[PDB]
Amino acid sequence: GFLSGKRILVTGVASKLSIAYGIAQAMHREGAELAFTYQNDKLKGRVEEFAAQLGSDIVLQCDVAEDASIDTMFAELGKVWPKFDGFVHSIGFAPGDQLDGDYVNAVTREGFKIAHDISSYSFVAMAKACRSMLNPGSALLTLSYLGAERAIPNYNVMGLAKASLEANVRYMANAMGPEGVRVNAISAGPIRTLAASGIKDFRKMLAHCEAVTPIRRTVTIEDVGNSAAFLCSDLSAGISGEVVHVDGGFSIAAMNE
Amino acid sequence: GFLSGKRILVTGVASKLSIAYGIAQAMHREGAELAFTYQNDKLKGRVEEFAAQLGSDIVLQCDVAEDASIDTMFAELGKVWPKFDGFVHSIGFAPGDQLDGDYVNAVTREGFKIAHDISSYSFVAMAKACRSMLNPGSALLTLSYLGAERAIPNYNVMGLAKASLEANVRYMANAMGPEGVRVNAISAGPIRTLAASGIKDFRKMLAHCEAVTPIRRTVTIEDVGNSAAFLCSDLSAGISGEVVHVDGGFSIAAMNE
Amino acid sequence: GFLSGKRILVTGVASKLSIAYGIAQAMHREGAELAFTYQNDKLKGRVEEFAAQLGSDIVLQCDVAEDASIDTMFAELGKVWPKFDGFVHSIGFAPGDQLDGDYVNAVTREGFKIAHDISSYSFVAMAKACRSMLNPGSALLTLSYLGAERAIPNYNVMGLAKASLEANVRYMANAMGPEGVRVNAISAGPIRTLAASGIKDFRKMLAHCEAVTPIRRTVTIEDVGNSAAFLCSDLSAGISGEVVHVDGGFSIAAMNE
Amino acid sequence: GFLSGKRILVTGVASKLSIAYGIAQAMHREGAELAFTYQNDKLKGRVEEFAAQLGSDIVLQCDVAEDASIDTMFAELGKVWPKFDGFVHSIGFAPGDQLDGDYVNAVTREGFKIAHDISSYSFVAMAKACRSMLNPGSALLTLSYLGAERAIPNYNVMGLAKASLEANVRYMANAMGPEGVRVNAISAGPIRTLAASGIKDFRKMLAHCEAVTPIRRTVTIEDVGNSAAFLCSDLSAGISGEVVHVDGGFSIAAMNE
Ligand SMILES: [C][C][C]S(=O)(=O)N1N=[C]C2=C([C]=C([C])S2)[B@]1([O])O[C]1[C]([O])[C]([C]OP(=O)([O-])OP([O])(=O)O[C][C]2O[C](N3[C]=NC4=C3N=[C]N=C4[N])[C]([O])[C]2[O])O[C]1[N+]1=[C][C]=[C]C(C([N])=O)=[C]1
């Protein structure tokens, strides 16, 4: 496949619904060698199962709120993958009270802080921690959302955190380009999931999108997974510092009434 | 003038070179009544002097790092201006080490945190605190920079913080619009000063802009002040949630060689 | 006022509903001296009446489809205003059939051609013709619409023509900057009228904007006029090559439901 | 390969240096079945040679300045490919006098017209002509350039034409989405070519780009070809109406001094 010979780290698998599960599946189908991280003990088993299913026994814990957690994980990784070809960052967080109602009223200093720390800083923290382990030709990928570009109801402070994240992509891309490392993001559309979201009225969002999206359907984790695999392969060597919208053309239309 | 009868709070005057000084000056010329804040004791006397020069005796302290400090200030302001028409937010900060050299190597969790806290969160923290005191037809304004949209050397983490700030402008605009409050930003070009910059190689950056800027000069605090006054008046009633570039066209050109 | 002593040519007045009327009105209030053009004989008397109302007796004909017509007009204008300070370009056109239904089915080579010719080329054609007559500190302004950035139903080919127009603004800005001419555009929101629109379902489009527009109302020609006056004054000396959105924040929100 | 089973039409092969040659090579490596067009007789032989080398004997003449030319070509194509899966539009043109010096001085009504007709209209003209022949799951691709977003010296009116083109992508995407056809563009960086360009000082552009581009090299026709193959495959089913920058991160940085 087009990822044959690549060794890639995938973060944020939490369930088969997780965008990262879709990315891992597709990367694995294209031949990449995979490693996985899990945030906490309550997730370990699951992830360990999925890894197995994808031919991997590299399964490490990592909580991005902790520097030491990140250092330790790469220390362990280095035991098996002294050098590797990049990683997928599919992680985010904000306290739920932040995600419901009038932004101005909902937002708090702490909520703001946490959201940006976990959803944005973590991306460069990881890079900082594995920089010297990366091969020439490596690629880093993160998952964004249209909320970084437009004010969306209830998404609230996540919007600011994702904007911060998209700038992080540009700053990282620029800084690590010359060493041979590419950095991009995928701005995915809302993905249908029966599972309960923390974002107030997500279902409504979904329904709306299906209706006014040019391609007339919401994207799947397979759509995202396939774009992610490509952006992480040498096939996209001419692309860096880019935020690729994988939302079926949703953001480019207006008034599809 | 076109600000006649308006009452506006101006923050971040620190010197005659401060962007807010140019803003207060122009606003005062157009007939606004102003109030001033100052960060700490070292700055109090300077602010008091400028304020008198501009006909104001409302000079209050406010450190945006503290919620208590913001509340206290608005509580005191409410003594003389029980309702007002908006404020200018011309504040930012990042620890020195953050603005020199390779972004990824320079960035730290703490640095990121302070940068986003004082530079982006503070804008909404102020709005939350005085929401009830604003008149319909009120306008809020903050100062941004191109680093939010493009990766610029040495600006590093401040780049991410401004991005978050411009998203704040949109989320704030959308939330407060229906109450009749407008929220905008001005992405100002680098301004020439004799003072010294904490941003590594700022002088070089000036020299370059001057050369390739379509209007062939850097903009002044009068340029910025004039735009801010307009953005804060009833003359811009149809503009909200916008980031207006006041940089003489610099950002719209490429390779002016 | 802030336009005092300025001499500005205003094009595209056709009625009291015309955007240019709102522009001339506001500019006249701020102290500018104006001149007016009119497309053909059917419009001459209306323009003459408005012009007198606004203290001007310079009313000249100009059909932008013709180079000769542009030259002739500036030759006549030069009789009274040998040098002036810029013009407002508020002209556009596309044949009826182009603005109804499926874009791909509606578009034609001719339609495309006329649309781009009168709607985009005319802006630079005017600048080329009067370049030598402009004072340093002059400003040119054109009127755009969101259709340039997003695909909006029925706007169809005009969408492509406005995109070309906004690029014209940047190329013009960059070319004329060093001579001291500024060039900008205002991307105005849909304005409510009793008149009738050639854009299929314009009324629906209004209704929708009203609902989801952050300031909860459509903008007026006074809103636009006020912004244009500012953009054409020395107060915006640091703004060039910009497309300022005067649509009450509409474009920066999504799913205001 | 990932294009196995697809039948794709490639326009604008003129030499082995042509971006379309790079796209055809990569699509052919991924298994697509190809057809080729040539503009005029002086190009026929060459193209016929290249097609042969890529396992194709479908080689038709087509001059996009002519509607009948386009109709006739699809008539002929339909003889062998009654239905197919899309096409690559790698065509553009402007008279050379347009591409040198001050934009305002260089631009003419005719030059403007031609540039937009051949470089932009042709893209929707082709779609219009083969709409009913397209399979569900089809994709259309065009080649843009950063000049559509920023004022670039000497690129002049091509800039306006490319902006028009990028809007065409959005309008087309929106209009044909619901039938199952995707439409995107690739905004490629300047590509090194020893062959003589019509754009004044192109070499300089090249040199500059190599130096300040994050990845520190210019992209190749292989880089572009690979992105094009992906964007034309079902692998990018979640992407439509997008302008993907394939320029090594060049457009996202500033002041790489
Ligand atoms: C909201 C909040 C949160 S976040 O941010 O996460 N998110 N989520 C969800 C969502 C969003 C948007 C939307 C629309 S929805 B967001 O914002 O984003 C997202 C993210 O980033 C990614 C991924 O996600 P998903 O896949 O979806 O999910 P999940 O599965 O859940 O995952 C997550 C993860 O994370 C992790 N973490 C946390 N925390 C932490 C971690 N790790 C470590 N450490 C720490 N601390 C966990 O564990 C898990 O795994 O993507 C995104 N997106 C974008 C777009 C769209 C989307 C959808 N879904 O639709 C998504």
Ligand SMILES: [C][C][C]S(=O)(=O)N1N=[C]C2=C([C]=C([C])S2)[B@]1([O])O[C]1[C]([O])[C]([C]OP(=O)([O-])OP([O])(=O)O[C][C]2O[C](N3[C]=NC4=C3N=[C]N=C4[N])[C]([O])[C]2[O])O[C]1[N+]1=[C][C]=[C]C(C([N])=O)=[C]1
């Ligand atoms: C870098 C870091 C920092 S900041 O501030 O952020 N900044 N600064 C400078 C600069 C920049 C950019 C550039 C290019 S330069 B920035 O980033 O941004 C800025 C800001 O925001 C504004 C204003 O500034 P200016 O005026 O310039 O300055 P100053 O005078 O210094 O001011 C400042 C202020 O703040 C305050 N604070 C702080 N902290 C605090 C405060 N308050 C309260 N609290 C706390 N905590 C002080 O005090 C002072 O007063 O603007 C901006 N900009 C933009 C663009 C451009 C510019 C120039 N300059 O050029 C500026």
Ligand SMILES: [C][C][C]S(=O)(=O)N1N=[C]C2=C([C]=C([C])S2)[B@]1([O])O[C]1[C]([O])[C]([C]OP(=O)([O-])OP([O])(=O)O[C][C]2O[C](N3[C]=NC4=C3N=[C]N=C4[N])[C]([O])[C]2[O])O[C]1[N+]1=[C][C]=[C]C(C([N])=O)=[C]1
């Ligand atoms: C559609 C097609 C056409 S146009 O004009 O282009 N337009 N119109 C309308 C409209 C639009 C958009 C919308 C949304 S609506 B458009 O596109 O754009 C517009 C223009 O540019 C301007 C102005 O308009 P108004 O004011 O509205 O209108 P009127 O009054 O009709 O005016 C026009 C004028 O032009 C002239 N012309 C033509 N042709 C010609 C001329 N001149 C010379 N030559 C030639 N050939 C006439 O005469 C008249 O006066 O603005 C715009 N806008 C934007 C935005 C929004 C708006 C509203 N309206 O809403 C507008």
Ligand SMILES: [C][C][C]S(=O)(=O)N1N=[C]C2=C([C]=C([C])S2)[B@]1([O])O[C]1[C]([O])[C]([C]OP(=O)([O-])OP([O])(=O)O[C][C]2O[C](N3[C]=NC4=C3N=[C]N=C4[N])[C]([O])[C]2[O])O[C]1[N+]1=[C][C]=[C]C(C([N])=O)=[C]1
């Ligand atoms: C300039 C003028 C012209 S165009 O437009 O063509 N172009 N060219 C070049 C260039 C550009 C940009 C730059 C930077 S350079 B442009 O603008 O664009 C381009 C195009 O579009 C495409 C492709 O190209 P190439 O490949 O490069 O080239 P060639 O090879 O030459 O090819 C072309 C073609 O076309 C055709 N045609 C014409 N005319 C016609 C036709 N066909 C039909 N009909 C008619 N009429 C011919 O034949 C040929 O084949 O891509 C683009 N790009 C983008 C970016 C970058 C680039 C580079 N190169 O670098 C390119």
